Design a protein around this ligand. Structure first.
Ligand code: CHL
Ligand code: CHL
Ligand code: CHL
Ligand code: CLA
Ligand code: CLA
Ligand code: CLA
Ligand code: CLA
Ligand code: CLA
Ligand SMILES: CC1=C[C@H](O)CC(C)(C)[C@H]1/C=C/C(C)=C/C=C/C(C)=C/C=C/C=C(C)/C=C/C=C(C)/C=C/C1=C(C)C[C@H](O)CC1(C)C
Ligand SMILES: CC1=C[C@H](O)CC(C)(C)[C@H]1/C=C/C(C)=C/C=C/C(C)=C/C=C/C=C(C)/C=C/C=C(C)/C=C/C1=C(C)C[C@H](O)CC1(C)C
Ligand SMILES: CC/C=C\C/C=C\C/C=C/CCCCCCCC(=O)O
Lengths: 220, 196, 99, 33, 214, 215
């Protein structure tokens, strides 16, 4: 099924034809015709929203991978630092950040130093990204630089590039949905997502989302 | 310096302002990463909202910090010096005393305060929006005249400089007010107590 | 509704017979076969389907479907009362508390 | 025009209306075996 | 007639004669000239916001009525609107009007699946059109949705539109009040009204809950 | 794929009779005995395959559902296991649907058999000749009154759905055969065997407890 043109897949199946905006002509990756609030009726705002969505999708994929991998590797020992939201305070402990369990890799003890270093490096990186030009010879596209960040040369055929763009906006959107689920589960049940999956697999009839429903009830 | 293409941008040496941000209006640092102001009407409404919010933020910050500093300076004993605890004073048996003096206000009824503030604020807001006794055909953003008794902002250059100073001071005041709110929410204490 | 009536059962029986006879004798007095089913007038105070249009036909279809459904439903009421010895809510309770 | 089939409906999917039932009456489904 | 044109009522009364946006001409119902945020400069976004507002108004009127009604009935134990969801986990399930054997809903996944399918179908029909009407208006279809023909005359249709949108806005405000008042007090709105009527001076917001809100 | 001359065959890259030209649904080109070398016999075999597929899908669902309901504490059937469910007519009160005495309460097997024979004969005669539910045009894909939701409207979607139906029916037939031989070997319920195997996959299987007892 094609993902471009007037005969592309859409966000409501057979019912989509009645809610497709005029400005959503399917000229961009991930165009399913879903805009019911008219938030992208301005062409400039549409480009800004596309940029924000792509960046957020990439960061959400990174976050999902970095929340899933450390728990599986625990091949290592962390204890209370295995959980993704419980690893924030592991630096403040007087043992250091034992990367993979070895207390000799980074041995981080201070907060201000790492914080300031991250601020300066990512400020430089994000300022270069906003400028779009600098020390690296990119292709000139802010959203898809390619010149330096594609050492394998996977983006050479325009049609293959478009198909890859569709696939990775889709993977990014799935990552965004999963990250929102991770956040909500962390606030609600206070357990790691793998533990939640194990509890659900143990007995799915009673260990579902509606079991922890009355815990938010405001008592007088 | 503060106006035209020579103005500094919001990312230091890096400067990629949007097309619609020409810098004519005060406090234009080219920060529209969301693209919300692509329409002139929405941009103008956002400018008005920003300046009004800035003025209210500076006023609120001064009103939040002055009484608690005065209490901590050993001048007078307030009922509750903490800025986010001023509402509980009206429920005390002693009422609301200005600077602690029982002969100043001694307000007791919250309903009367609510009604009086509602009518007065509504009348002055309607005057500001439409034009009342304090001038009718004046600027909505900078009416001047009765609102500039000193006449400092008369010539264009000083007017623009003072407007830029107003906008940046108001932005700093808004950031400070948000910091006040977060600090109070987390620490459950006064701002100056956190400072010291 | 739990309120004892001031009438005797003999008086009530005679009154029911007389009133129903009078009402049905009034009803039988019509001569137009069309108005024998839809009299209108005092029986259509809101004037919902008293003209000749598509709106009255839909209302008549709804009325006839509701009539048929209620007829079958009351036949079910009677047969359930015969078999299980329960009413309507009683039959619902007996069915629910049998799984 | 999606999510269903476009498809007079009688009491049987394949049956004919009786001669004396012309469909003018409201609830006429051609049902008189 | 008085609700349209340049002489319609404004949202700030006489203090908004000159504070009227250029694009809020007044050909749409409920146009009081309250757009002091510049959120409807684009006509397409304006139309989408109008549709969202009407749908929200209808949903809010339904929700307000359905939150008020069950609390006033003895059969349902005067249950609050925010506590009725967990009755499906009770030893008796959900029984309509308190009459045993009416619904007896004990499973939550079954009701969730049925609602998902039914709501999906009806929402798709609303967006695209279906057996209940095709090619009709997006927000005010009519036809099968106006069985009584209460809006045949266009003037009556406009007056009813203004009445509907106003009742919907009031219901939205009341539903937000319901949410906030359930969050703060922790009791049903009807019990709150009864307590206020019993002692207005004592039982209110400031006298009981505002003092310990910060 | 799934149609024309370039469709996926039944041996993947290791793969054909001349009469299997990639026109009919579910044609993977597996006819080694040459039983479908006659076009008329090919049509008959296709019709029997489709009917068997539908019947086997229904049978698999009806063999899984009651035992799944019983083992989860959702109902109390007389005999949840599928091969023992036919003896409920010889119990004390008879056969009760879902365990409720006020649902079916069947007691006589003769009446059951007579009614089933009459109804099944009438409807199968309607299927092969045409009757109240429509007139026969396509012997296995009538449509019209049997497709109310109109899912088989577009011809492309019709072909895709035909392929999906035939594949799910073939899988259902295989699972039906497995269910039969497991009943004839293990003597317990299908979901019971699944639960036992899931409890201890290494030790609970056909070889560990039944391979040696076969001979
Ligand atoms: C992507 C954005 C981002 C997000 C969503 C989070 C999210 C989280 N961090 Mg992290 N962080 C993020 C970026 C960063 N963090 C940190 C450094 C820290 C520290 C030092 C700590 C956290 C902790 C936490 C939690 C803070 C809120 C809470 O109530 O505690 C959740 C827990 C409760 C039970 C209370 C929260 C789960 C804190 C935490 O609570 O760790 C256990 C913690 O101490 N973060 C840095 C500096 C390197 C970041 C840089 O961008
Ligand atoms: C305009 C911004 C404004 C803000 C941000 C706050 C913020 C706060 N007030 Mg204050 N107030 C504000 C205006 C006003 N307050 C009050 C009267 C009170 C009281 C009586 C109390 C607070 C209290 C509080 C704290 C908890 C919120 C609550 O109790 O709701 C109260 C807020 C309102 C009823 C809103 C007033 C109408 C609105 C501005 C229009 C919170 C820090 C409480 C506290 O400090 O306890 C520890 C409390 O007891 N406020 C009045 C008089 C009508 C106000 C008028 O503008
Ligand atoms: C002449 C004086 C007059 C005044 C002063 C108002 C004032 C108001 N009208 Mg009203 N009206 C007036 C006359 C009339 N009105 C109406 C018909 C309407 C309608 C139909 C509506 C209004 C609404 C409103 C509100 C619009 C702006 C607002 O919400 O921000 C005012 C200020 C703020 C909200 C800031 C408060 C601070 C902050 C929110 C609190 C902080 C939170 C706490 C910490 C907790 C405002 C309270 C609208 C509404 O919102 O009603 C509820 C609306 O729907 N008016 C008519 C009929 C023609 C009038 C006739 O003269
Ligand atoms: C806007 C959406 C909305 C939503 C989501 C809900 C949601 C809910 N309602 Mg509320 N409600 C609403 C609007 C809404 N309501 C409105 C507008 C009204 C006024 C009519 C009510 C009045 C109401 C009542 C009276 C009750 C609820 C209850 C319920 C709960 C589930 C019951 C159920 O769905 O019945 C399933 C679906 C139906 C359509 C049932 C209708 C058919 C019944 C069997 C007919 C009864 C009539 C019949 C003639 C018998 C009565 C005669 C009697 C004397 C024997 C659930 C919390 C029930 C509960 O117990 O909550 C605590 C309950 O008792 N609601
Ligand atoms: C993207 C896929 C995804 C997947 C596979 C899961 C998977 C899981 N979720 Mg998570 N979740 C997600 C997204 C997802 N979630 C999102 C977007 C949210 C925020 C709305 C949540 C919020 C959430 C809560 C509040 C809970 C779970 C829990 C669970 C478990 C199922 C129980 C249940 O009732 O589901 C409920 C599922 C939904 C509310 C999400 C949307 C419905 C999907 C898309 C269908 C299971 C481990 C439960 C658990 O941990 O208990 C042991 C539980 O308490 N999830
Ligand atoms: C009351 C909220 C508020 C509002 C409405 C505005 C409004 C405006 N700002 Mg200001 N600003 C604020 C607070 C605010 N600012 C604060 C706290 C700071 C300090 C970080 C700044 C610093 C700042 C810079 C550095 C720049 C602006 C500029 C502008 C314009 C850009 C459009 C924009 O996307 O914002 C409007 C939209 C939103 C604020 C959405 C609301 C989201 C909530 C508030 C979060 C717009 C007129 C740009 C300019 O050209 O000035 C004329 C510019 O470059 N602002
Ligand atoms: C078809 C016509 C019909 C008939 C013949 C009856 C007949 C009867 N009704 Mg019923 N009833 C009907 C329709 C009908 N009802 C409707 C439409 C309602 C809903 C308003 C009721 C609600 C109802 C109640 C609430 C009660 C009855 C009761 C009774 C009995 C007393 C009659 C009475 O006192 O009238 C007086 C007229 C005024 C009698 C057996 C009573 C009963 O059986 O008590 C044991 C009683 O309590 N009926
Ligand atoms: C392929 C055909 C098929 C056949 C021959 C059977 C045959 C049988 N089933 Mg199974 N079944 C099937 C498919 C089939 N099933 C499917 C697809 C499902 C899922 C919906 C089920 C779920 C199921 C349940 C839940 C139950 C049976 C039961 C039985 C018995 C039926 C007695 C009855 O009262 O029927 C009378 C039938 C009707 C009046 C028709 C309408 C029935 C509902 C309302 C529809 C009989 C042994 C019963 C039992 O004894 O199991 C142990 C029982 O309770 N079956
Ligand atoms: C720029 C841009 C651009 C792009 O495009 C996009 C984006 C990024 C989104 C954007 C951004 C934005 C922002 C950041 C904003 C912010 C804001 C704020 C913070 C405000 C505040 C604001 C704030 C404010 C007003 C405040 C106020 C306050 C007040 C009055 C107070 C009062 C008071 C007092 C005296 C004291 C007492 O005891 C109490 C009270 C009574 C309480
Ligand atoms: C105008 C303007 C202008 C300028 O320019 C700007 C601005 C200012 C922004 C604007 C404003 C706006 C606003 C104000 C809004 C609001 C809204 C709301 C509140 C809504 C609600 C809304 C609301 C709603 C829907 C609601 C709904 C509800 C519901 C369904 C309910 C349901 C239910 C019931 C029955 C009961 C049970 O037991 C439970 C449940 C199930 C839960
Ligand atoms: C046209 C009128 C025709 C017939 C009416 C005839 C009779 C009315 C019925 C009377 C019933 C009297 C029952 C007396 C005993 C009641 C039970 C008791 O109190 O023990």
């Amino acid at each position: 099924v094609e993902f471009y043109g007037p005969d592309r897949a859409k966000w409501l199946g057979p019912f989509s034809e009645g809610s497709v905006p005029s400005y959503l002509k399917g000229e961009f990756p991930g165009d399913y015709g879903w805009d019911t609030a008219g938030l992208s009726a301005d062409p400039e705002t549409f480009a800004r929203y596309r940029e924000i969505e792509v960046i957020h999708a990439r960061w959400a994929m990174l976050g999902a991978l970095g929340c899933l991998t450390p728990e599986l590797l625990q091949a290592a020992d962390f204890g209370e630092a295995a959980v993704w939201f419980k690893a924030g305070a592991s630096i403040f402990n007087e043992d250091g950040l034992n990367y993979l369990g070895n207390p000799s890799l980074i041995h981080a003890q201070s907060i201000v130093a790492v914080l300031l270093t991250q601020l300066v490096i990512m400020g430089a990186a994000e300022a270069y990204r906003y400028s779009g030009e600098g020390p690296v010879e990119t292709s000139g596209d802010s959203l898809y630089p390619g010149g330096f960040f594609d050492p394998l040369g996977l983006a050479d055929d325009p049609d293959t590039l478009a198909e890859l763009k569709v696939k990775e906006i889709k993977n990014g959107r799935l990552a965004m949905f999963s990250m929102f689920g991770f956040f909500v589960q962390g606030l609600v049940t206070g357990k790691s997502p793998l533990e939640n999956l194990a509890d659900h697999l143990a007995e799915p009839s009673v260990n579902n989302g509606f079991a922890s429903a009355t815990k938010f009830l405001p008592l007088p | 310096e503060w106006y035209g293409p020579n103005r500094p941008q919001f990312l230091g040496p890096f400067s990629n302002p949007p097309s619609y941000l020409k810098g004519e209006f005060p406090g234009d640092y080219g920060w529209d990463t969301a693209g919300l102001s692509a329409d002139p009407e929405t941009f103008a409404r956002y400018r008005e909202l920003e300046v009004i919010h800035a003025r209210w933020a500076m006023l609120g910050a001064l009103g939040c910090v002055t009484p608690e500093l005065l209490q901590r300076n050993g001048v007078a004993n307030f009922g509750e010096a903490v800025w986010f605890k001023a509402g509980a004073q009206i429920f005390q048996e002693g009422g609301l005393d200005y600077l602690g003096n029982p002969s100043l206000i001694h307000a007791q009824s919250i309903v009367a305060i609510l009604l009086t503030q509602l009518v007065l604020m509504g009348l002055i807001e309607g005057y500001r929006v439409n034009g009342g006794p304090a001038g009718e055909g004046l600027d909505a953003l900078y009416p001047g005249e009765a609102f500039d008794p000193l006449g400092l902002a008369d010539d264009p250059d000083t007017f623009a400089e003072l407007k830029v100073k107003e906008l940046k001071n108001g932005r700093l005041a808004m950031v400070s007010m948000l910091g006040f709110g977060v600090q109070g929410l987390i620490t459950r204490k006064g701002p100056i107590e956190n400072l010291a | 509704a739990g309120i004892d009536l001031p009438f005797d059962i003999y008086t009530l029986a005679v009154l029911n017979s007389v009133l129903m006879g009078x009402v049905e004798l009034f009803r039988n007095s019509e001569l137009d076969p069309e108005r024998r089913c839809y009299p209108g007038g005092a029986f259509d105070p809101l004037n919902l389907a008293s003209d000749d249009s598509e709106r009255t036909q839909k209302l008549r279809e709804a009325e006839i479907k509701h009539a048929r459904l209620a007829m079958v439903s009351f036949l079910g009421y009677t047969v359930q009362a015969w078999y299980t010895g329960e009413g309507a809510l009683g039959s619902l309770n007996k069915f629910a508390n049998g799984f | 025009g999606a999510g269903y089939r476009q498809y007079d409906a009688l009491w049987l999917p394949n049956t004919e209306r009786p001669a004396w039932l012309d469909g003018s009456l409201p609830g006429d489904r051609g049902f008189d075996p | 007639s008085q609700w349209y044109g340049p002489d319609r009522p404004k949202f700030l009364g006489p203090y908004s004669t000159n504070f009227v946006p250029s694009y809020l001409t007044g050909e749409f119902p409920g146009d009081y000239g309250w757009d002091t945020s510049g959120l409807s400069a684009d006509p397409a976004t304006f139309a989408r916001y109008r549709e969202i507002e009407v749908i929200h108004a209808r949903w809010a009127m339904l929700g307000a009525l359905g939150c008020v009604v069950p609390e006033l009935l003895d059969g349902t134990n005067h249950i609050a609107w925010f506590k009725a969801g967990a009755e499906i986990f009770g030893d008796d399930g959900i029984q309509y009007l308190g009459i045993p054997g009416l619904i007896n809903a004990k499973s939550i996944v079954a009701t969730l699946i049925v609602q998902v399918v039914l709501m999906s179908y009806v929402e798709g029909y609303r967006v695209n059109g279906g057996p209940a009407g095709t090619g009709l208006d997006a927000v005010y279809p009519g036809g099968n949705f106006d069985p009584l023909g209460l809006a045949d005359d266009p003037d009556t249709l406009a007056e009813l539109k203004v009445k509907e949108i106003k009742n919907g806005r009031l219901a939205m405000l009341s539903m937000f009040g319901f949410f906030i008042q359930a969050i703060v007090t922790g009791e049903g709105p009807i019990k709150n009204l009864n307590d206020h009527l019993a002692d207005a001076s004592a039982n209110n917001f400031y006298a009981l809950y505002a003092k310990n809100l910060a």
